[PDB]
Structures are given as C-alpha cells and as structure tokens.
C-alpha cells in the first residue's frame, strides 16, 4: 500500500549510497590509524594505486 | 579547486552523463593520512 | 466519514497523497517553483498587475515613521521622551530620504523603495532578506547600510545535500531557530565560479547582521512558500489558451475566398478575381479599388468562405478563470482584470472592503516587521555615536530593552474612497462626538497630526500678518 | 505542492524555466527588446496613447518647485531659511523657464519638457539618463547645461564581451554601485556607433556629472527593463489580427455579384449587366431588369457579418494590455461603456494611485538631482546668500540644503461641486491645512495670499465691494 | 545562443567536463576578417 512515485525512489537510493561511501571512508581511516599503533609502519597499496 | 576547496576531508559531488541509460553518480574523496609524532611511546606485545 | 475512504463510487480510489511534513513537501522542488513564479511575473499581463497592486496598495508612495517609546515601563517621564522622539524622528527623516540614495550599498534605492521591493519579493518568493553592513572608508555621519539579498542567492555550500541542521542554507540549532545563512556570490557571466559565505544572524553582543522575514505556513517551515503555488498552473494554461485562440482567429480570418477552376493557375486568377496578368512562384496581386462582378464559365466557381465567430464564448471563460485566479491571489476581480462592469455602490464598496482587509493584514505584518527591524538596526549606531542622548534615570540601558527604547509604528498611504463627501462627513461626525481622536482621523489620511497642527498655527500667523481674514480654526 | 511537480496530468512536464538572475535574463537580448518596444511606440495607436497618458497624467502641463530646507538640523532659524528659500526659488524660476531654451545644450527643450521626456523614456525603455556639463565660452549668468542621453547610447566599448565589473557599459565597483558610464557617439549618415567615451558619474568634488534613474526588482540589476515585456507579444498579435480582419472585410465586400453564362466574355456583360461596350464599365444610373436565356444565370452574393464577434475579442485583449501597462482600460481604449458614477470613480482612483506613485518616484528623483546640481553652482557664484551661523556648510549636507518637494498638475474631478465641498468641509474642521488644498489643485498658497491682498487693495482703491477674504 | 552572444568580438567560454578525471579548459574564438572599403588609397613601393 501507499507506495511512492518513481521520482521519490530516486531520493532514497542516493541517500544510502552516500551513507555507504561515508562508512567506507571511515573504515579506511580507522584501519590507517590502527595499523600505525600495532606496528611502527604501514603500507598503502591498491590495485590501481 | 574551482570552488575554492583544498586540503579538506570528504568533498562530495555528483554529475549526470546523459548517456543512453542516463545515470547520476555520487562520490567522496578525502586523501587521509594518520601519523604518529612519537613512535615508541607505545609497547606492542603478542601474547602467544 | 466518506472523506477518508474510497469515495462516492470509487472515484477517489487513486487519490492517496502522503501525509508528510511541510519541508519534505516544499523543499525538494523549491528552486523550480521560484523560477516558475518569476517566469510568470516577468511574462504575463495579470501577474505584473497583481504585483503592482501589492506594491502600491500595501505601501504606497510614502512610508512614514511614528516613534512612540514606552515611557511608563522605562520609568522616565513625558517631556524628555517627547524631545527624544522628536530628535530621533528628525535624524531618521534626514537619513532615509537623502537624495544621494546612500542608505543601501548599491546606491540605487531609498528607504521607501527598499520596503516596496521587500513586499514585492515577499509576494512572489515567500521571503525577503536584508543585510546590514558597515563601510570604514565612508566619512558620513552614519556607517549603517542595508543591502537587499535575492532569495536565489541563499543555498547550500558547494551544492551539498540537506542535513538535519542545514536546510537550504539556513543553519538550524536543536530548536527551530536559525543561526546563519549561506549566501552565494552570483556573477552575470555564467562561467565564473561562485563562492559561498557564512553570515551570522546576530552579531556577538547586540546587533542583527542578517534579516529574514516571512510568514510560517506551518510549524517546521524553514523557507516559506510563495503565494503563486495555488494558481500557477491555471495562469500558464490560460496563457496557452489565449495565444492559441488568437492564432486560430487570425488563421480563420486570413482566407477570404476560394477559387475553383480547371484552367491554368494564372488564367483563373486573371478571369475571376480580377488580377493583372501584366506585360512584364509569386502571387499576382489584385487591386483593391472598386466593386467587381466576375464572369464565370460553366467549369469555374467562386466561394466566399464563412468563418466562425472570432470570439465564441471566450470572454466568459476568461471571466471564470480570472475569478479563480483572483480568489487565489487575494486581490479582487475588479482590481485584477480591469473589467469594472456595471455594479451599484454597495457591491463596489463591499469588494473594496474585502480587498482592503487583506491588504491591511499584509502591511501590518510583512513591511512593518522589516521596517521596524531596520530602524532598530540604525538606532543602534544612532545611540553609539552619541548623535542622540538617552534620558537619564532610566530603568534600563539601550541593550536590555530594545523593543521599548525603539518602539515604532508606521503610517502608509490610505484608501481613496469611492465617494468624496460621505467619508469626510463621517470623519467630521466622529470628531464631533468623542468616539475618535485627531490622531486616528489624521492617520487615515496618511498624515501626522502634529505636522497639521504646526502648519495651521503657522497659517494663522501668515493670514494675520498680511491683513486677511483669520481662519476658522483660530482661537479668539 | 503541485506547482513544482509534473502537473495535473503531466501537462507541465516540459515547462522548466531556468532559475536565473535578472541580469542573466535581460542583458543577452536587451537591444532587441528595446528595438521592439520602440517599434510598437512608433507604429501603433495604443502604445502612443499609453505614452501620452503617462506624460500628461504623471507630469501634466507644469512641474513646479517648493523649497523647504531643514532649518532645525542646520540650526539657522526660521526667517533666514525663508529668505534663502524665496531667493533660491526666484533664481530657479528665472533660469528654468527661459523662452529661448538655454537650459539644455541642444536648445530644443525647456525644463518641463525635459522632465516629461524623462518620464516617457522611462516608460518605454525603463531608464532615463541625464548629463550635466558646463559651457565655458557662454556669457550668461549660469553655465550649467543638462543634456539628455538615449538609453541605446550606453554600451560596452568596441562591443567587446561583458566582464564581471562592466555590464552593458556600466562599470561597477566591488559592491553594486556604479562608477562611470561608457557613452557612444551617433553618426547619422551611417550605422552603428563608432566612438566610445568615458564619463565619470560624479566629479571628484562630489558634484553630479551623470544621472541614472530606474527601479530595480531583484538584488543585482545593472540596467533596467521597460514595462512592455508583459504585453509586447499580445500587442503585435492584436495588430496582425486587426490588419488581417480589415483586409478580409475589404476583399469579401468587393465581389458584389456573379454572372454565369456560356456566351463570350463581352456579350454576357452587354446582355445581363447592361454595360454597353459596342471590361465593360457599368453606369450606376437607375434600376435594371435583365432578361436571361435558360442557360444563363445571375447570383447576388451574401457575405458574412462584417464584425462577427471581433469587437468583444478586442475588448478582452485590450483589458489584458491595460492590466499589463498600468493605465485603466477605459483610458487606453476610449471605450467608456454605460457605467454609473461609482464605477467610474473607482477606476479613476485605481489609475491615480499608480500615477501618483510614479510621479513621487521617477520625476521627483530626477528633478531633485538636477536641482541640487544647479544649486551647487548658485551657491558658489554667490547668486544666493547662505544663512549665517549654519551648523554645516553646503558640501557637508547636500540634501538638507536642497531638500525640496515638487508639485505637478492636480486631478480633474468628475463632478466639480463635490470636490469643492470636500475642500471647504475639510478646511472648516481642523483635519487639513490650506497648503494641501492649494497643492491638490496645483497652486502655491503663498502666491495665492499675496494675490488676494493685492486684489483687495485694488478693489478698495477702485471703489467696489470688499471681498470675502479681507477682514474689516 | 544559450547566452545570446552572436556576431561579436572575442567570445570567451570556460567549461568543465565530467567523469572521474575532471579537466577544465579555456577557449576564446572569433571570426576575424579585415576589409578595405576602397582598395586604392595606398601605394606600397619596394625601394631597393
């Protein structure tokens, strides 16, 4: 019941996409912080970086 | 850099590619670096 | 209750609008709504008419100040209060109506035109914004200037998404209040980038550095919605109907007659219409002079086309749509459509009364709030620079009770009645009884009673000096 | 909120106006808009009527001056202020109303004509430009001269692209304030301007050198827009409809009859019309009764009604145009349907409100600026004498010294008696003064009083009955 | 036509493309042609 017009469903997927991006950034920052405490050094590596 | 923002954290944006399926993207970019001033203030031990 | 259900015969089955807060219903299409309202105002006959009525009836040609500080609360007195009021009024009167137009930074508008533009922007945008600034280089008596801001300039920083505390650039604390506004910098060249600036609403200690005035339709509104939203669709579709009807009428009236013949393309026109084949794919033109009777062979023929009524009932449909639009916008039908058909005195007076109630309401709320806030902003620098002196033995200083020290009421242009003698005879009858004062009856004319008393007491002296008859109002 | 959505049934799925500032929506096609407005002014019956109504209602036939310096602020007293006002008014009256028209450089206009043309220029172009210069070689008392500049003459140099600081020839400082205007030079035996000169708005001494007048609506507006944009399209389409209807009526009424026969071209007109030829011009004398063979025929055409509902459509469009322009419908179209007194008075009030507003803003600002520009020279050349012990000099407080109010023509009432009864009833009570009632008719009360004392003196010296205003 | 500039001198524009690597360009274009109304008021000799 209720439901929303197709124009509205475009405003929810965008919000959760932004939330997911922010959460990924936060996890990257946390790993970057933690790896510098357990050991003196860390290495940033990636497939295209 | 056109807007005037530099050395910030989590700069967001979006654009439309006007392609055959359309599409509207979303992006965040930060360039983070977490550093420690005094490295041997901690002591790490494994506890095998 | 059938209203909350399917309907009479299920006709309302699909009509299920969601019950959502006012922001979630207005903001997602705010820019498009403002742009459509502006497009209507710029390129429609009736929209500009409604805006001009708003500007010229709410404010008029002069917006007069009346300073009435609350002397009793402050525990000051009467005579020094009157002296303070007189000095402040004179200082303001010089400040506002300088013909150098230095009150605003752009040096384009005086005080009254600024308030008129404020009412205009509130009429088709739902909000007006005024910023109070300073100039260090300026060497004039007052450093205070008021810069108007278009509601389009106020938006999010770098076009980011809305959040819990920031909605359309109006930063909001835990409650419903507002702290600062994000103002962009727009450039007429469309390629240059734009930069957003954060301007707080209140300066650290006492003064307001950004003014926002509107009428909250509901509880949680952050940016109000303009008054066209009820009736924009009808205005645009009426414009489309008008243009289509006019083009159709021109097309129908263009084709005067029709030729039916089997000969050449030119011989038929030569022999029937009465053109000129001439001695020396273009249309051979006839000569309009005379009355001609063509001679038709059995094959040929001539048809004088008959077109429909060029106005088959369009005026009545215009009447219905214009009544709808006038009901939506608040102005009466006569003041909007300029129809002014035959009607007695009672109907005209009733319609004018109904329009005037709404106009008085708008004047009391919108323009009055804006003017009072701007006046208090000026009075701050008036007191600081010692241009005027506060009464001694005051219960409070200026900062503590801003409203009481700068309490003011504004006088705008009054109503021009339908009949002349009746209103003034009414005013005289009221004056003769105790039911009214001279201030109330002089204010309904847009004049301040003290000025009239001063002019009358000067005129008595003038008439006495030259040997003329003393006026009626003079004392024996 | 259906206004900002798709619409009722998706009808407004294509109406997407761009949210753009007034400069971004007026500048790119400004010259074309002004050209079309001028085209309507020069070639339509109603546009010229609206311009004439503006000129003759807002300004009238005379634009008078009333000088009232703020004596209390300067701390100069009453009588010195009155003497200064009288001298300044006398000097201005003697300079502005010269019959040889030396106030303007072109020597083609007086003062009232210049103000009327300023209002008219504001009417169809949206703004008026006045330039104030000195003529050194002149041998007159006052060297001040004012020259009008048409709004088309202000444009960017070399027609270069606009910048952030210079939009449409108006150079702008950090804020929205203007500094100087690029004015072109018109070469008539040619086309398009060829020389651009810089004219600073204000001289370094604070005097006025260029005057700019208009009414903005949005925040940033470099140059103003005319009043025709709401009804330019309907006016042109009405013109086309009118001309097409007129031509169609002429064509339809032209073909009076129709002859159909199998004989030759000439013999049919010989035998059925009666136009002797021996094509064939007919003689319009008498009434004729032709005789036809069975194959011949003669038909008398019946045309449509000449005005099949066109008049009411013209009424509707004219009401729309009158709503757009500002003047009431009866003034624009000269219609004057059967109506009572109350409706006429209501409509006249609706027009007079707007006209009074325009007079108080446009003409008043222009005349005040010109008067101050002239007054600076007078004070310098010692034509007038400043009161002694003034708190401020002239330069410190310009507006306080030159504070003046202008009086134009008064309204012409529908019934003369009722307004006179208004004046006398207001005067009998204390609700109004003689100054306002003399200003409502367009007169200065001081001159009326002086004329009245002179008249009673003349009557007494001649031996007639004393007038009512003289007291025994 | 979007900003109404047509048949003018040195029309500039500054735009930014889309995509993950965004690059900004700057360009001004004109249509310059020089003409002499009367070709003959000049004599251009070659000396030695």
Helix/strand/coil (H/E/C) assignment for every residue in C77-142: CCHHHHHHHHHHHHHHHHHHCCCCCCCCCCCCCCHHHHHHHHHHHHHHHCCEEEEEECCCCCCCCC
Residues of D whose CB is below 8 A from C271? 265
Residue B2 contacts E where some CB pair is shorter than 8 Å: yes
Burial tier of D271 (Cβ tally within 10 Å: 0-12, 13-18, 19+): middle
Alpha-carbon span C297 to D130, nearest angstrom: 71
Helices C111-125 and C368-384 sit at what angle, rounded to 10 degrees? Answer: 140
Nearest by Cα to D249 from D300, D303, D301, D309 = D303
Residue C5 contacts A where some CB pair is shorter than 8 Å: no
Minimum Cα–Cα distance from E9: chain D residue: D160
Answer yes or no: do E5 and D159 touch at CB < 8 A. Answer: no
Answer yes or no: do C16 and A2 touch at CB < 8 A. Answer: yes
Distance of CA C316 to the CA centre of its chain: 28
Which two tokens mark C228?
């066209």
Chains C and B touch, contact meaning at least 3 pairs of CB atoms under 8 angstroms apart: yes
- DSSP-assigned letter for residue D427: H
Dihedral (Cα; D190, D193, D198, D200), 10-degree rounding? 100
Cβ-based interface (< 8 Å): residues of A facing C? 2, 4, 11, 15, 18
Answer yes or no: do B39 and A40 touch at CB < 8 A. Answer: yes
Which two tokens mark C424?
């003034």
Minimum Cα–Cα distance from B13: chain C residue: C160
Helix ranges restricted to H, D126-225: none
What is the residue-wise DSSP string for D57-122?
HHTTT--EEEE---HHHHT--SHHHHHHHHHHHHHHHHHHT-TT--SBTTS---HHHHHHHHHHHH
Answer yes or no: do B28 and A25 touch at CB < 8 A. Answer: yes
Helix (H) or strand (E) holding E12: strand E11-16
Answer yes or no: do E24 and B17 touch at CB < 8 A. Answer: no
What is the interface size between A and B, counted as CB pairs within 8 Å? 34
Instruction: Give the largest Cα separation in chain C, rounded.
Output: 113
Alpha-carbon span B2 to B15, nearest angstrom: 16
Give the contacts of D25 (CB within 8 A, at least 6 positions apart).
Answer: C42
Residue C67 CA: distances (Å) to CA of C84, C87, C372, D234, D469? 9, 10, 10, 48, 39
Alpha-carbon span C48 to C37, nearest angstrom: 11
Other Cβ atoms closer than 10 A to C233:
19
Partners for B (CB, 8 Å, 3+ pairs)? A, C, E
Residues of A whose CB is below 8 A from B26? 14, 17-18, 21
Q: Give exposure, C404-413, as e/b (b: 16+ Cβ within 10 Å).
A: bbbbbebbbb
C194, C184 Cβ separation under 8 angstroms: yes
C146, C132 Cβ separation under 8 angstroms: yes
Residues of C whose CB is below 8 A from D240? 250
Alpha-carbon span C235 to C377, nearest angstrom: 40
Answer yes or no: do D161 and E4 touch at CB < 8 A. Answer: no
Residues after which a C–N gap over 2.5 Å breaks chain B: none
Give the contacts of B12 (CB within 8 A, at least 6 positions apart).
Answer: A18, B26, B27, B28, C160, C161
Distance (Å) from the alpha carbon of D56 to chain C's nearest alpha carbon:
19
Minimum Cα–Cα distance from C190: chain D residue: D24
Alpha-carbon span D6 to D12, nearest angstrom: 6
What is the interface size between A and C, counted as CB pairs within 8 Å? 6
Bridge partners of residue C303, in order along the sequence: C258
Answer yes or no: do B3 and C161 touch at CB < 8 A. Answer: no
CB-nearest partner of C420 from D73, D324, D418 = D418
**Which residues of C113-214 form beta strands (DSSP E)?**
128-133, 145-149, 166-167, 170-171, 180-183, 197-200, 211-213
Instruction: Give the largest Cα separation in chain E, rounded.
Output: 63
Helix (H) or strand (E) holding D259: strand D257-260
Residues of C whose CB is below 8 A from A11? 28
Helices C30-42 and C232-254 sit at what angle, rounded to 10 degrees? Answer: 40
Task: Give the best residue of C155, C156, C159 to mutate against chain B (max B CB count within 10 A).
Answer: C159
Query: What's phi and psi for D422, nearest 5 deg?
Result: -55, -50
Task: Give the best residue of E15, E22, E23 to mutate against chain B (max B CB count within 10 A).
Answer: E22
Residue B47 CA: distances (Å) to CA of A39, B44, D378? 15, 10, 101
- Window 9-38 of E: residues touching B by CB (8 A cutoff) are 16, 18-20, 24
Nearest by Cα to C200 from C216, C186, C211 = C211
Alpha-carbon span C134 to C304, nearest angstrom: 76
Which two tokens mark C75?
């525990």
Rg for chain B (alpha carbons), in Å? 20
């Amino acid at each position: 019941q209720n439901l929303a017009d197709p124009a509205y469903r475009r405003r929810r997927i965008i919000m959760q996409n932004m939330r997911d991006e922010e959460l990924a950034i936060a996890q990257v920052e946390e790993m970057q912080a933690v790896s510098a405490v357990l050991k003196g050094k860390y290495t940033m590596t990636g497939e295209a970086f | 850099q056109r807007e005037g923002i530099n050395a910030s954290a989590r700069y967001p944006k979006n654009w439309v590619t006007t392609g055959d399926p359309a599409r509207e993207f979303t992006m965040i970019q930060s360039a983070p670096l977490m550093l420690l001033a005094d490295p041997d203030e901690f002591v790490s031990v494994q506890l095998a | 209750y059938h209203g909350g259900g399917s309907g009479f015969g299920g006709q309302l089955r699909s009509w299920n609008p969601p019950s959502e807060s006012v922001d979630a219903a207005l903001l997602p299409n705010f820019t498009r709504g403002n742009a459509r309202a502006d497009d209507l105002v710029r390129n429609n006959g009736y929209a500009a008419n409604a805006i001009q009525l708003h500007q010229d009836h709410i404010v008029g040609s002069f917006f007069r100040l009346s300073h009435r500080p609350s002397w009793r609360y402050l525990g000051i007195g009467e005579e020094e209060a009157r002296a303070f009021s007189r000095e402040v009024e004179a200082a303001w009167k010089e400040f506002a109506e300088d013909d150098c137009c230095c009150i605003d930074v752009e040096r384009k508008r005086t005080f009254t035109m600024m308030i008129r533009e404020g009412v205009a922007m509130h009429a088709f945008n739902g909000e007006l914004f005024v910023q109070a600034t300073w100039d260090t280089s300026s060497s004039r008596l007052f450093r205070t200037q008021f810069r108007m801001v278009s509601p389009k300039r106020i938006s999010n920083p770098n076009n980011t998404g809305d959040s819990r505390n920031c909605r359309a650039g109006v930063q909001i604390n835990d409650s419903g209040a507002a702290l600062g506004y994000y103002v962009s910098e727009d450039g007429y060249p469309g390629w240059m980038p734009q930069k957003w600036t954060w301007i707080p609403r209140e300066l650290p200690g006492g003064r307001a550095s950004f003014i926002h005035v509107f009428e909250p339709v509901e509880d949680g509104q952050t940016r109000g919605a303009n008054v066209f939203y009820s009736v924009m669709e009808q205005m645009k579709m009426l414009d489309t109907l008008q243009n289509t009807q006019l083009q159709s009428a021109i097309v129908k009236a263009m084709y005067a007659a029709t030729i039916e013949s089997e000969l050449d393309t030119q011989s038929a026109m030569d022999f029937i219409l009465g053109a000129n084949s001439q001695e020396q794919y273009a249309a051979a033109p006839v000569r309009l002079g005379g009355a001609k009777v063509p001679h038709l062979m059995p094959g040929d023929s001539l048809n004088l086309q008959t077109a429909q009524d060029t106005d088959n009932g369009y005026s009545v449909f215009e009447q219905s749509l214009l009544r709808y639009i006038a009901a939506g916008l608040g102005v009466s039908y006569e003041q909007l459509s300029r129809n002014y058909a035959q009607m007695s005195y009672s109907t005209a007076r009733a319609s004018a009364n109904e329009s005037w109630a709404y106009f008085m309401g708008r004047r009391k709320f919108v323009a009055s709030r804006q003017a009072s806030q701007m006046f208090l902003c000026w009075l701050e620098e008036a007191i600081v620079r010692r241009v005027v002196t506060l009464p001694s033995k005051a219960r409070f200083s200026f900062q503590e009770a801003r409203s009481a020290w700068g309490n003011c009421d504004w006088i705008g242009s009054g109503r021009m009645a339908i009949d002349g003698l009746k209103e003034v005879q009414e005013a005289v009858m009221l004056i003769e009884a105790g039911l009214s004062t001279y201030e109330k009856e002089c204010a309904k004319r847009g004049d301040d009673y003290q000025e009239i008393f001063a002019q009358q007491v000067r005129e008595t002296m003038e008439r006495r000096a030259a040997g003329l008859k003393p006026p009626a109002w003079a004392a024996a």
